[PDB]
Structures are given as C-alpha cells and as structure tokens.
Amino acid sequence: EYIENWNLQNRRQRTGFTFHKPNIFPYSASFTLNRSQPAHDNLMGTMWLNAGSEIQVAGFDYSCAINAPANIQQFEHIVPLRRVLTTATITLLPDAERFSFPRVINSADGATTWFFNPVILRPNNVEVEFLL
Amino acid sequence: KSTIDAAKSMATNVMKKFKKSGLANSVSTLTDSLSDAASSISRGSSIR
Amino acid sequence: QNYGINLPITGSMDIAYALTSTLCLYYPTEAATEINDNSWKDTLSQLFLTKGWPTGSVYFKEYTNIASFSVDPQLYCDYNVVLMKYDATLQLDMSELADLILNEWLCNPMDITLYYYQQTDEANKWISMGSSCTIKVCPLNTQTLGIGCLTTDATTFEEVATAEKLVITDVVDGVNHKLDVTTATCTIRNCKKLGPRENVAVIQVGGSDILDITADPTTAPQTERMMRINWKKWWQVFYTVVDYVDQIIQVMSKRSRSLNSAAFYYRV
Amino acid sequence: QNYGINLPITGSMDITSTLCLYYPTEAATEINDNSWKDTLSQLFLTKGWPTGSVYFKEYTNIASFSVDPQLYCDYNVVLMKYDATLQLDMSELADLILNEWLCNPMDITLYYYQQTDEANKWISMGSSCTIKVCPLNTQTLGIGCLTTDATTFEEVATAEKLVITDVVDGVNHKLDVTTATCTIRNCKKLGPRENVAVIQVGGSDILDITADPTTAPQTERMMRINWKKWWQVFYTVVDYVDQIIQVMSKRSRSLNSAAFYYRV
Predict the structure, then answer these.
(1) Centroid of chain to Cα D212
(2) Distance between CA A62 and CA A44 in Å, rounded?
(3) For residue D136, what are the β-bridge partners?
C-alpha cells in the first residue's frame, strides 16, 4: 500500500491513505470562559479535551441560565484540522465522561485554583457541522 | 327556518363566545410565535 | 488596558506555580468596658507584628450599640472583620445588618411624596437607614385605588416597621404603592442586589446562629463569610481570632470592585 | 384505569388549584383590619390565582391547632409562631403534618401490644391525655410495675394535647390512658407528604421528624423566617409563593391513580 501511494504521488494521481483510528487531533486540553468572577461564585464557560483520536467537549453554567433570555444558554466550540479528511465515519455520543466528576482546576494567571462540582443534563438542539 | 323576532345580532352574539375559544388563543399564540421568530437573533435560536 | 469589554480569557492546566493586605477590625463596647485597659490595642498591634503583619496597618473603629452601628456602615478598608455581640432579643436587626453589609446593593434614591413605585425582581429591595424610621405603605390595584388603606389621607395605611433605624423591605412584585416616611429623619433607597460582597467577614459572639442573607424563605444558606464563636471572656475571643486570623484572611478575597481591572464595572 | 398492579413503566432520554393558609388569631388581632383576606386575595390574583378559591383558616393556639388536625386543600402553607416552650410539641406536630400515617384503633383494656417495625409509632390526641406504660417480660409479667397496679407505671407524657409515643420494640407493654377523653391510634409512617409546607417564624430550625436520634433529617419543606410585624410575613408569603409551589407537589395520593394502592 505505502509504496503504492508513493508511486502515485509520483504519477500525479489522487493519493489515498486508509487508517484505523487516526491520531489526527493534536493534544491540547484547555478551557474557556465567557463570564468570570475572581472568586468563582458566578461563571459561564466551556471545557474540552481532544486526545488521541477522540474529542470530549462540555459547556457549563452555574446559573443554569436563569437570568439569561428565554431560559437558554448557547455554547459554541470549533476545531480545525491541519489536514483535510475524506469519507469519515464518525461516532457521536452525547456526554462528557471525562468532565463529570468534581475537579480542582488551576486558574489562568497561575496563583490560585477553582472548584467544579457539575451535574449532568442532556444537551438540546445539538448541532454538529462538518464544513469544508 | 327559525322565523321569530328578537333575532338579534346572532353573528355578534356568536362572536362574543367565539372570541374566547381555544382556537382563537391558539391562533394568537401562533402569530406570537411567528413574531418571536423575527426578533431573536441577539439571543440564539431558542426554539428546537 | 482593554477595559469594560468582556472578552474571553485563555488559561491552562499545563503549568504549575511555585503585606499590602490590611486587616481592619471593629469591636463593640461592653467588651472594652470589661477589658479594663487602654493599651490592649497596642498588645494586639505587637502580636500582629510578630505574626507577620506591619505595625500601623491595623485600626480599631468602635461601634456603640448595634442599632447605632446600623446607620451608614461605610466599611472602607482592605479587609474587614466585624465581631457582633449577640442578643437573644435583638435578632432581625442582626440578620439584616449581615444581609446589608455582606452583599452589594446598587441603589437609586426616591421621592415618595410624589412618585408611585413598584419592585421589579426577587433581587430588588428597599433599604431604609437612619434615626427612627416608621414606614407607611399602601398597596394599589391597577388604576390607583386603595386596598385596605385610604389614599385620601395618610394615617390609615399598613405600617411594616416602627422604632427601627435600618430596615430592608421586600414588596410584592408588580404592584404600585404609596409611601410615607419623615424625610428629615431617615432615608430610603431602592437597591438592586447586584452580587455578593467579599470584603467583609462577620462573626458573632453569643448565643445560637440565626444568620441568613437571602430574604428567600426556601434558601437559607450558610455562607463562609459568616462565623460563630462562644465566649465568657472577650480576651480569649480577640486572642483566638488573631490565632486563626491566617485562616480567616485566606477565606476572604480582594474586593472585586477595586482591583484596577474592575474599571467601568460599578465602582472603579 | 389499570390500578392494583405494580406494573413497570418504561421511558427514554429523548422526550384548578387551591393555595391554603392557616394563621394564628393573635396575628389578625395585631392587624385590626377585617377586609385583609380580601386584599391578599387580590394580590394572589395578581400573582396568577383564580378569584375566589383561596381560603384562610384561624386557630387559637398551637395546642388547639394540634387536636383534630385536618388538611384538605391543594397547597397548604402552615405558619407556626415559635416558643421556647413547646419544642417537643412543635417537632411532633410538624411530624404529624409531614407524613402518611396508616392507622388502626386500639383497646387497651383487653390486649397487649407491640411495635414490630421501626416505622411504627403510637399517636395520641385528645382534650387532656396523659398516658402511662409498663413493659412486660416474656412471661407477660410487669417490671417495676404490675398489671394490677396503675401507679407504679412509667410516665411518658402529661396532659399534652398530642403525643407521639415510641418504645423499644419486640416487647409487650400494658398501658394506662383515658379513652373517653383521648384516642390512641397505632400508626405506621409510609412516605412524606407534598401538600404541606411548614414555615416557622422565630427560632432556629430545630425540627426532628423522626424518633431516630442518629440523624436529624432536614428537608426542603421545613422553612424558617423572622418577623417584626405580621404583614411582613404575609407579604413574604405571597410574593415568594412560586418557589414554594415548586417545593410542594400535587398529593401523590390525590391523583386518580393510587386507587386500591392504599389510596387516601
């Protein structure tokens, strides 16, 4: 197979590399806030870990969107890839098993930490968009 | 075939009851929905 | 630098990490009257000095009676601790004093001789401070007709507080009311409960705890900024609150309104 | 429709009224108005209640309120004015008004008795009820008291308008009551009631709804608030009513679903 893809990228034909569970997502485990208190008695943000060949995202709010309009809080998160893929068969499970247990996490500036005791709901109007 | 006097505003007397039936408030709810659709962009699509 | 435009902030979970904070203590009278000395302040000062805290950094402002301390509690200082001497007969005032000086109230003034009013949300209250407040309130239906009270005069309303210096009413939302006080005696301000205040820690020296800060019946929480200790000699109370003053200080935090970055976010 | 079975329910993870207020008389006495109930009715209208279905009931003293207690109404918010005197009375009163009590009568002149499960109590109500007990050996013989006596008994309560009596179980006891003055029903607690919410005024949330010492189970129904005037309490009641409504649920016995399943 590999010599063949070689001779093909030599012969100017569409190359093809098949793969089982590719480690295409780079490693970066970081979080993002939309609203922050220096003591964390009022927050709104997201966490996400993208490792190996899978990604786990989880958006969280402390107010459960009570003050927000029409009792709805949006969450976005995008991931670009450095190499386009083809004919992918993706699996999608709604949860964050990795973000489901009380954590103590380090702040952005690096002097103190903050708490996390989340309780899981199921997400509504989940939209996944594979754009080219 | 009811031919009696005092045949009052049968239409409007009908209307007095009709303007409170469930279909009416539901139609108003439908128009209210269509209105909500035209305002909320600053809040994200809140309707499933 | 870039202020007042709330933009997201990237932290990380990838890097671990290896004085000017000023305590400002208050205290009541009968304690002092029993202390029987005028140097006790200096002893506290030298102790704090040995604990790692500068001399000249701690100041003692004294309140005489709890109802006296209720007016104008501008507790401006880097970190504030209030020891209140408990009463088994003066309770509601302690609860509301805690409520006031532990939360942040942004309020606008009123002119009740002219305007009708109405509360808006479960986070909107009416604080009333001064010498001797006697609130007079008269609810109204939708087109300004007295309900249980007569609006053609003033003395037939339904009073909600008498002989009080500081009281914070909460009214049924969404209905207009007529109001009266003596606007040369005390003043009422319509406050919105913006967000919890973190500059202060209140500890009570006396009977059982009663403290709640939510005027919500269902939610009667026990925050951390509310502490309780027993006593039979105030000396030990002072000595001890200085023995653990490290932990107390680590519990509170810098006032989230004066941080040079709270600019254009309500007081800075 | 299909009652009387315990038929497992499946599911998935993709899919009038009555507000009912009891109050102590001293309050309206302090109020000195009379049209007040009508005023608060108007206010409950403004918060969304139908006009002319909300009822206020008046009890003279908590002792009085203890005897013949009956709540029949969709949503009950019961106020209680604390006193450092009746801590037992108020505890056991909130208890009797927090649970579902499967009860049967008793005749203490003809048999012995027992407690067979930890969810079993002996409740007594009456005008002037004062009960005495004497536990019995396995040979049906009295100890520190004799079935022939009525005075060497072991006193457990005294002229209490109400009492919730409990003893060590698996053991028989001969008692002493006055039945043409008092009734004692053998009752078993089953679940918590959702038609009642007990707002205490004054005090420090001291309730205990179980004769169990080891825990003091605090819940979402035993609320507390402070007072300096009554209209203060009533305004807090009316304005904050929605969260209270969210606390108390429809009477799980009430729905035409519990039929022949020890339905009320």
Answers:
(1) 17
(2) 7
(3) D142
d(CA C214, CA C123) in angstroms, rounded, equals 9
CB contact under 8 A, C160 and D231: yes
d(CA A102, CA A100) in angstroms, rounded, equals 7
C103-109 and C186-196 strand pairing: antiparallel
Return the HEC string of B1-48: CCCCCCCCCHHHHHHHHHCCCHHHHHHHHHHHHHHHHHHCCCCCCCCC
Query: CB neighbours of B30 closer than 8 A, spacing ≥ 6?
Result: none
Could you tell me the resolution of this structure in angstroms? 4.5
CB B40, CB B46: distance < 8 Å: yes
Report the C-alpha gap between D81 and D61 in whole angstroms. 10
> Which residues from chain B sit within 8 angstroms of residue A69, using beta carbons?
40, 43, 46
Q: Are strands D222-225 and D196-201 parallel, antiparallel or unpaired?
A: parallel
Q: Do residue A125 and residue B40 have CB atoms under 8 angstroms apart?
A: no
For residues D227 and D202, the answer to whether their CB atoms sit within 8 Å is yes
Nearest to D78 by CA among D235, D226, D244: D244
Q: How far is CA C164 from CA A46, C69, C74, C168, D215, in A?
A: 48, 12, 19, 10, 40
Element (H, E) at A31: strand A28-35
Classified as helix, coil or strand, C180 is strand
Give the method of determination: cryo-EM
Report the candidate in C241, C242, C246, C215 with the shortest Cα–Cα distance to residue C227: C241
Q: What stretches of chain C show up as alpha helix (H) in DSSP?
A: 29-35, 40-51, 66-69, 92-102, 234-243, 245-251
Task: Supply the angle between the helices D230-239 and D36-46 in degrees, to the nearest 10.
Answer: 20
Can you tell me the distance from the alpha carbon of D159 to that of D179, in angstroms, rounded to the nearest whole number? 13
Report yes or no: A124 and A71 within 8 Å, Cβ to Cβ.
Answer: no
Beta-carbon contacts of B28 under 8 Å, excluding residues fewer than 6 positions away, are none
For residues C215 and C170, the answer to whether their CB atoms sit within 8 Å is yes
The DSSP annotation for A82-105 comes to SS---S---------SSS-S-EEE
Q: Which residues contact D5 (CB under 8 A, 6 or more apart)?
A: none
Please tell me the distance in Å from A6's CA to the nearest CA on chain C. 39
Give the distance from residue C6's alpha carbon to the nearest chain A alpha carbon, in angstroms: 8
Candidates C158, C177, C210, partner chain D, best to mutate (most D CBs within 10 A): C158
| Separation of first and last alpha carbons in chain D | 17
Cβ neighbours of D204 in C, within 8 Å = 208-210
CB contact under 8 A, A69 and B43: yes
Asked if D208 contacts D156 with a C-beta cutoff of 8 angstroms, the reply is no
Helix residue ranges, H only, chain A:
2-11
Task: Find tokens 């969810």 and name the residue.
Answer: D119
Q: Beta-strand (E) ranges in C144-185?
A: 158-169, 177-180
Both tokens of residue A90? 């993706």
| Dihedrals phi, psi of C89, to nearest 5 degrees | -120, -15
